[PDB]
Symmetry: D2
Subunit: 347 residues, 4 copies
């Protein structure tokens, strides 16, 4: 009893929608969310926006599902509105489609919750369900979805953590052994006040092979890669407008192919799935420093792995940048301007 229904494109979902839904859910015993999609309209919206990746219907479903995880009276549905006139001219076919969708899903709504004053009479006259206006003057939040899509980094405090991955500009740094990748990633995450992701390969090697790579085999090489992804998902979930990644899947695929002689289908699937906004490739220019934790001191093998990284980066058609400064300070500076140019703010 007392069923509440919220309609919305939710593209993207922001804290105004959250405030609306959580003001509505405290007033009803069960709240149903129905989000409609159209492939061409959503594709155009993504094209004209500043999102890093294009969401799919399951991805936006995941947004809404992760937002209300600890609220047990909220259900989520996705609806298809192909072959319909756009708003506000397709007010007849859309209503019939939504009525059929509710009939299929068994929903018997009693109240419709909305924050548009002109849309309420239209809802009442078509869907025949009484509507309740929540925050009609937009006192809690005044920012609109278009302003968020155009400039997300100025309204960063209104974007939930589940919606953040499609707005975070992820930076992947690649480099040879003992090239200073980890310290550079840490410094970049520090000055930018954001998160970072470490190379899961070293963690896996120590926590499963006692710290030696002699016992590494083909079947292991697909855990590492997948484990690496579990770090990336973390760094992008809590980033401050930018996240930094210590190593790509190109490097793990390269290690797998060079040691075991054959590729791995799931690492290639991850390569295809995971696309990075900016990729930075360091060089082997820095002289070798003896440490004691790695006996692979030969620079010929380093150059061979670097060249194989270049060719495998070209194989998947992945764009990257090269930094050639021997000194660490200049390389840090150049990475700073690269990130700042990626941000899109000029001098």
């Amino acid at each position: 009893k007392t069923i509440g229904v919220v309609f919305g494109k939710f593209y993207p979902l922001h804290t105004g929608h959250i405030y609306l839904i959580q003001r509505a859910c405290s007033q009803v015993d069960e709240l149903h969310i129905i989000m409609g999609f159209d492939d061409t309209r959503d594709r155009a919206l993504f094209e004209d926006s500043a999102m890093s990746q294009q969401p799919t219907v399951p991805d936006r479903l995941r947004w809404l599902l992760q937002t209300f995880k600890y609220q047990k009276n909220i259900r989520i549905h996705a609806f298809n509105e192909e072959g319909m006139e756009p708003y506000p001219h397709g007010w007849d076919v859309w209503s019939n489609g939504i009525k059929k969708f509710m009939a299929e899903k068994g929903i018997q709504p009693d109240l419709i919750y909305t924050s548009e004053e002109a849309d309420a009479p239209q809802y009442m006259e078509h869907l025949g369900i009484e509507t309740v206006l929540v925050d009609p003057k937009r006192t809690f939040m005044s920012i609109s979805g278009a302003q968020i899509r155009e400039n997300p980094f100025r309204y960063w405090e209104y974007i939930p953590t589940e919606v953040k991955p499609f707005f975070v500009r992820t930076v992947a740094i690649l480099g040879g052994e003992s090239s200073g990748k980890s310290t550079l990633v840490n410094k970049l995450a520090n000055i930018f006040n954001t998160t970072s992701a470490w190379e899961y390969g070293r963690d896996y090697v120590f926590s499963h092979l006692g710290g030696d790579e002699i016992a590494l085999q083909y079947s292991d090489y697909d855990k590492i890669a997948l484990g690496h992804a579990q770090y990336i998902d973390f760094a992008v979930k809590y980033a401050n407008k930018v996240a930094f990644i210590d190593t790509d899947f190109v490097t793990t695929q390269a290690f797998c192919k060079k040691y075991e002689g054959r590729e791995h289908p799931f690492v290639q699937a991850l390569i295809d799935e995971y696309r990075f906004d900016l990729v930075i490739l360091l060089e082997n220019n820095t002289p070798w420093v003896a440490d004691g934790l790695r006996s692979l001191g030969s620079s010929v093998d380093r150059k061979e792995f670097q060249n194989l990284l270049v060719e495998m980066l070209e194989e998947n058609n992945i764009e990257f940048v090269r930094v050639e400064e021997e000194d660490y300070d200049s390389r840090f500076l150049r990475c700073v301007e690269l990130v700042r140019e990626m941000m899109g703010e000029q001098r």
Copy 2:
């Protein structure tokens, strides 16, 4: 061996200082930070600022130590400058004191890193050490420490996560069991796009006593409270200008004293140590619903625990607010407006 020294009040530490220190540390083999303090001056600065809690010398040492955890060439020292003329009249006694401080600490600095163009000649002529200017035009960051102290919620992206606990306005919600504390805390953390801390008591009970409180004893009551603190430290470390706390130490003292007959010194020390900016107290207005897990379903026991909570809140002289609305939506609105008044954002 190419020693670099940075001087600073660092009160509070912000991303401009971080950028300075990490531009300096990549250029030297070892960077020493010397932080001078004066009790009365720092007390006045805290009084005139908007910080939630007053930092101590160990607390700011902890700031600087947690910032550069993964940078292994940075050392931190604290120095006392009592009985010295303020800047810039005290350019002679301070220099002698700081020189004696390096003498006692064994530092032999070679370079001093600073971002003040006017201060460089005094450094050169007093300490006899060449100075290096880093970002003299403040291109990377232009915000000053005073602007952060006066209005920290507008420059929130420049405050590190180690310095954040002394700026986050922590809200503690108190209420009886099965009164809706958890859902309210979750909703407040959702609409405000911030973190929250759950009641560690339930977690401890399930993970150590099989989910029943019959096996609870006096010596257990000091684990729970301390464990509760480990949640609070998390919520304030990642908050979006405000953190929400599900239960205070007053409640665990209440349970301990009512079930065991005696208090516990450590949880009282925690009460003294942990001070909250806003405390909200709910009522027993909501009717009891049979759950099969609590035998104290009578409203008499609930009222007794509520009155004991009130008297123990008065015993420690802790101010709080009372919300009496039976409906959930009105209570949520009252909590929202209380938090908004606490924010202080004027119109």
Copy 3:
């Protein structure tokens, strides 16, 4: 609704009781366990047994509660039989007492589950409740509780992990800084194929103070102590008849008193609560090892801390042993010899 009741002192609980309870609970909607205790009888049983620590009524309640944590239809109660007639007269007063106890606890049992052939007719005669015999020939398990109490290390596979802490012979190793405690504890845990507990203080310092001890304060010194306990609870929960502990609460109390001038009530409460079967004290025979973390390089301070450890060990009247061999191999041999003697079983 189809209520089953199981009686027993469960002192200690073993896998025969577990098998009986699982077989009973697979056949009833809810199973109630009622365990009776008598102070003098239980004290005598503990005295004549080989348990390391004496359980209390809450401790045995915790055993039974942690055993059936994921079985949601099992309840647990404790009953008092003081002022009781001597055996075998204890079949009439005990029946009245249990009937009354079930009266205030509201239980209305329908079946009594037992594994005694002769006790069943007396149960039927006194309690008036039909009894069901489970495994009357003891096919699944034949070992009795007395054999477990006398020799627990020969029937180690029948003792649950919740009951194990009162049978594990915990060994605590104490020694000066950089004396080799960690490697010795690891070797002892390796050759004995068991668990160990690391010093939580180092972990806390690195994970909360950036790895330096300057930011350590009085209020911190309690967390460390409690954290240390959380390691001990782990090591004893999975030990192979013996668990090894890297540091006692005497050392953390010593550090707190030396660096603060006052003790801590909760560390003293932990000292009183936590009693170790064997305590081993090492010497300062090995030369100090430079690491870069300690400014107290003088051996005078090391000897002062060692003497303070001795005096604080004597203050609470805690017995210990001294190992004085300079070489590591002989010290390992002496530790093995001491542990083997403390086992008490020669072959």
Copy 4:
């Protein structure tokens, strides 16, 4: 310098070898272990033994690497002795092969550590390196490797946690939706005093999709499987002679093929890699009980999934057992006799 070398096939490694190696490592600055292998001899040894799975050279390397993880002065190598007459007549070419291996690996041994009285003069004559006898009377451990291979469950306390996975008899239980297999796995782990592994799919669904499977996609179906393996590795690492597994990879393959319409190469690779000693198939005897979390309440879908499970089990040539008894107590009993027959220890 003081280099020490230990020889042995370590097939399997037991606590006598650990005691030898850790008595030798305290006496030398660096210890080297060299495992010689022969494919046919090792295959015959595995055939005549009672191991559940056949180790490979990397697997035994992993044993030795994980055992001495926290001992930093131990290195591990593998050596090939193809075309060698067995001991003790192949004492001539074997010495030359080991000398060449020393030359390749750069080892310059100073002492050889062994526990054989007759081999010491032979070692001195051939390898020309002084030998040290450790525990020649086998006082600490007297059990031999052959006794462990023939009967591992009577010397279970001598098998390290790294070697245990190749001796644990893993049991995998398969059942329909809401068939109660988790409680059965828990009961079996309880009465056998061992570990178990839960279905990682439910955990992944709640922790990544808000608790609903609507947002499940093809690329997700490969994390779940991998995550499931991470549970299995745990359960077998701490098992008491037997580990219980809640779900196989056949079920996740079934779900992936049924919903997404296509298989996944990595889950098939896991199927090939992970072979279980006993597989138990639970059918749909128990009637479906409505809960509100699954809308496929019809038994037709359950029957279809069971039939697809059967055909995919037959496709991979995996043997299994069907338990059709309705009673939960009877099914628990039947699983008990199945596990006991697998144990092979009769009356």
